[PDB]
Design a protein around this nucleic acid. Sequence first.
RNA 1: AGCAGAGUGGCGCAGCGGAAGCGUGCUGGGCCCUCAACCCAGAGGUCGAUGGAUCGAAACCAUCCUCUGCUACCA
RNA 2: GCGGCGCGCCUGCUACACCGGACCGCAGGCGUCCCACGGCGGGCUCAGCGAGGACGGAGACCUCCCGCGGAGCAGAAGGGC
RNA 3: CGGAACGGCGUCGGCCGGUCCCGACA
RNA 4: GCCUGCCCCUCGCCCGCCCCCCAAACUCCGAAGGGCCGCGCCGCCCCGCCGCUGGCCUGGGCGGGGCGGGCGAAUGCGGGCG
RNA 5: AGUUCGGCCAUCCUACGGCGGAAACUCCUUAACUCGUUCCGAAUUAGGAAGAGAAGCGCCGUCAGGCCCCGCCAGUACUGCGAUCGGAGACGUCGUGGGAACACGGGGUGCCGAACU
Lengths: 166, 55, 195, 293, 156
Amino acid sequence: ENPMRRIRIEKLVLNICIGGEGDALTKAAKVLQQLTDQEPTFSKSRLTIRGFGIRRGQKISTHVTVRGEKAREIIERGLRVKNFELPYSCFSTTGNFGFGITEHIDLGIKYDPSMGIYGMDFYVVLSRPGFRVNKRRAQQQHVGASHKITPDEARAWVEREFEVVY
Amino acid sequence: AKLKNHTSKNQNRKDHRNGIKKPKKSAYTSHKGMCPKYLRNLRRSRANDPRQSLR
Amino acid sequence: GRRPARCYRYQKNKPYPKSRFCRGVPDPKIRYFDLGNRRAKVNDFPYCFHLLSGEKEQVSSEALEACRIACNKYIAKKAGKDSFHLRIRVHPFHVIRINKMGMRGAWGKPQGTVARVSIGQPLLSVRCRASAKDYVKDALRRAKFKIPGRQAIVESRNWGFTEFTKEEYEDLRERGELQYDGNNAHRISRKGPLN
Amino acid sequence: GWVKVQKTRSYFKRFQVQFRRRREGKTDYQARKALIIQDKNKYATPRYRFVVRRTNKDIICQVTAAELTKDRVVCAAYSHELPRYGIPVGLTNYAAAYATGLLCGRRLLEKLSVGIKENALAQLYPGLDKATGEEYHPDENENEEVHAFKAFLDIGLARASTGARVFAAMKGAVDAGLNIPHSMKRFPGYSKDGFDSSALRDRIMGKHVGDYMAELKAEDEETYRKRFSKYIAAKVEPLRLEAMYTKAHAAIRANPQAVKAKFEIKKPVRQARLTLKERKERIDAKKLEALKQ
Amino acid sequence: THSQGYRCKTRYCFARKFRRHGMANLTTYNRVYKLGQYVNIKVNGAYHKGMPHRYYNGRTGTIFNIGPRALGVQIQKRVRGRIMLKRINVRLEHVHPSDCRKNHLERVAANDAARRLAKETGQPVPCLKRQNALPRAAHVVSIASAIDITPLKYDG
RNA sequence: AGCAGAGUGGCGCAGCGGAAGCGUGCUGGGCCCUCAACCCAGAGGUCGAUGGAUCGAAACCAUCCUCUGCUACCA
RNA sequence: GCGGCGCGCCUGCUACACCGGACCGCAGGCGUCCCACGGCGGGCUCAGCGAGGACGGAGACCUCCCGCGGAGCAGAAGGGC
RNA sequence: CGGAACGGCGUCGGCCGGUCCCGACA
RNA sequence: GCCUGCCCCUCGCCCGCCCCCCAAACUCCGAAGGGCCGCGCCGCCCCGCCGCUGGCCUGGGCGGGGCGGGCGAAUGCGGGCG
RNA sequence: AGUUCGGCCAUCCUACGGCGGAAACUCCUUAACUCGUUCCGAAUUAGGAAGAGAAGCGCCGUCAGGCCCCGCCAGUACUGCGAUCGGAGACGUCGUGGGAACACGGGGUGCCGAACU
């Protein structure tokens, strides 16, 4: 029951893979910025594929990493769009989980013709105090199996914090 | 037309006929390729006191 | 027509396999090496007979195919396909070359494939039950005529294809120190995680 | 669903463990080779590096020369000793860094000149008596007969940043009288045009800590108590911050000599490794439990 | 050979060992070197500057020059019937100290130590010359339990 | 010997990393006073087999079978 | 002769564990490309498993996790990292 | 008695078993 | 089984354990066999010299003087140079 | 005991399950500054001290994997040197010297200095 065993959201990543249009990607950046109050980053394409209509190095996506209150405030709005219903399978082996919503209108953004509907995938990463051991530059060592979040431990904390039904 | 391209037979015998000659003794002590600075210091050091042949 | 074969009887060249360097090798004639009831348990098929090789020679895939067909039919006709499991131990990995017809640019293009063998190397081995035990020696003698040089058929002390001799296998099976793995079996191996 | 194991016996057989201190994450070998290398024409004359290391609650400053099988520490100073010199709290702050750097330099320069008693180190290179945050080089200003002890900064896995605590400790050592090569770019007050002495002095003499302490007192008193509970306990005021450091820099200069601090060695409970028969006893019994089922 | 570039036939020579890839242990730079010292040259593949040729691998030599970042070594190459001293400049990584004279150096000191006692306690001096094994000696050995051994019958 | 191309509906001949395609035969349906044309449907394929190669191959690649064109240095 | 170019050079092999070894021997390259694909400092981790997350599948993006290099480093090949 | 795979109740010498005074339908 | 149902069986596909036979241009291992080098001059104290080296009184070279010493594998054989 | 800098760089590694912290180390705790982020106080930089053994860490376990050592493998496989040795050859012997490897069986599972508390 150590306070250091408490599970907290590490962060929320909201990615919008529009494709090779370019025009839509800037508009998605604007939608992301209004939700998070921080500049989004653009992700280049690794290879080129005609089926996706993308050439290598074309900016093809937009993402933001939000931590703190802004993280769970945004996550709650996304969960409301799915009526607090989660797939159960959505929990990863490492204890993270994701939503994925179609449309930006539901998150409370106001529809405008300049930015058309842009769905995004919400990924929530679940941490605990002491996971810095794997991310520090000096003396980086892997977290212990005990302190790593089991998939079951993730489901239990999200059911307490968000009342979700699987 | 075609003749032998290469042979090594007898070449070792020819080498050992009077050979396996060691490489001088001056070569083992020569100052070729030595550090230009160390050699300057040696000259200055041996140019003072009994070693000095400066007159 | 595949040449006389006295041309490629001895291992006179360093092993030349099919590789990135050796391309266009004609496919080996023998593709079926496990024949008979190749799925029978280790406790079935107790006796073994081995055709050994008395020479360090190269046998051709054509020869290896001709022998397996001859040996399989005799023991299947005399007894049953179910009675025995015949393994052609040698596989054709060397790729023989032919210089088509002077000595300029003589490097030959692949003509086929041969199996490099040695002295005492089993070439054909049969695991058999009692119904076919007598017939196996005759069947491997039929195969001896398709193989170049002198070969010998001998009965094997080792149970089936395992390394346990029939005496070791019987004792271990009685004390439950033998774990079955299918065609073959191994010792109980007391090591590793206890769980 | 049926995965292939990444760590097979092959991966464990072909694996080459890195150097113990690189596996630990404590040592950057590429950086240390450069500091360690001396021309072979200079033979075994000792080369010295100034290691400055910041823990969560400490600033460890050491001058070490690398022998063949070990590293010999010529002189060490730790911020833990600053209370003796009059710095009660803020022992991991920029001001503490400078103090530990001055202590390291003064402790070493005295330790070099202990019995010479003629023209040696501490008398020859007294350093900046007043801790102004001005560029000072003990070397270059004057180096004849006796020369300034020369050391090179080892920052370890710490990032080199403007106003970094590792740079401040080096400034303290230079101010003690140690030749540490520096350019002042990564120092508060560097402008492409030229250094502003006051900006370095302000961080060296507290300032930003004191300003924050007074800002919290001015507005959030509850936060003020939480942020600076030890400072309030030690009765360290925000205006008085510069003065305590000024007295401490005199205290470190006057008596830099190390005084051994006593402690007691207590081992923890420490469990015992079992004997082979003890291991065999457990194994045979564990198998018997499986037999009993 | 139809191609003879600087690093030909060096596939297994200049390759690193099984688990010994990576940077050099810092002792290679730290080890002190003196003029006239015996040095064994073993090329390390990772470091590419100052690399001795594959011929110089495996050759003991003496340090003619101790210079910044580099040791000059005199090794004797037998070209035809003449052995020639070749002076090579090798960087620290591809040179190592040699124990060639260590047995002589050990013997010189041991010979003096016995001699020092011969000057003082126990004045007679033991022979201080290496003897090449010598032809055994006499001795009585108890046959007592001697196992009678017979050639064993052929199995196969 | 060795060299190139192909092998796909019954006949042809395309395709060529995501179907099998068009003509003919081949019936049917139109079309007219009837017939010829013509139009439009319907159907037709181990794509010569095999192995590889792929999420997937008629295709691409190896092996092989078959055809079909090219072939021997005066002294 | 025709046809090739071991006619200058390079990698692995032939080559028989120092070095040296022959062939119109084997499997291949070179005659260029880059003011950045260079120098240097900092930071970083690669290819991927596996599990997740609107469209989204074989396939693009985003996460953790474990990752001795299984990636990359202009082009042959072998080392090297 | 250049020479092979293969044959030989030619003749001496082995190796490993069975039937053997329980004398090898009575 | 039945509107259907993946409500389900059977091999392939993945994963593990085995197992037959391999490599001039594969190697974790690794011979025989070769290669290079050493096998006489030490140790001790003191003293000089250097644009060299360095926090230094540090070295590192190059010499000199004392103080004790001692020729320290086998075999054969005088070597070198123009 | 524990830290900082080291030496050789797995007997030191990896997985999992335990145990223990007085101090130390760490996690931790906040951005007024200083610096920082293809976005992000994640890292990093500054400033702390409300917490904590939960991890990292230090010990201990496991018929664990790997790694280390020693047997055995095996005088085997190969091979140096002699053979008017055998064999049609292929290859093999015999004198005379060297001598592996894979498995397999057992046992292990970091140590060394400088400073400091």
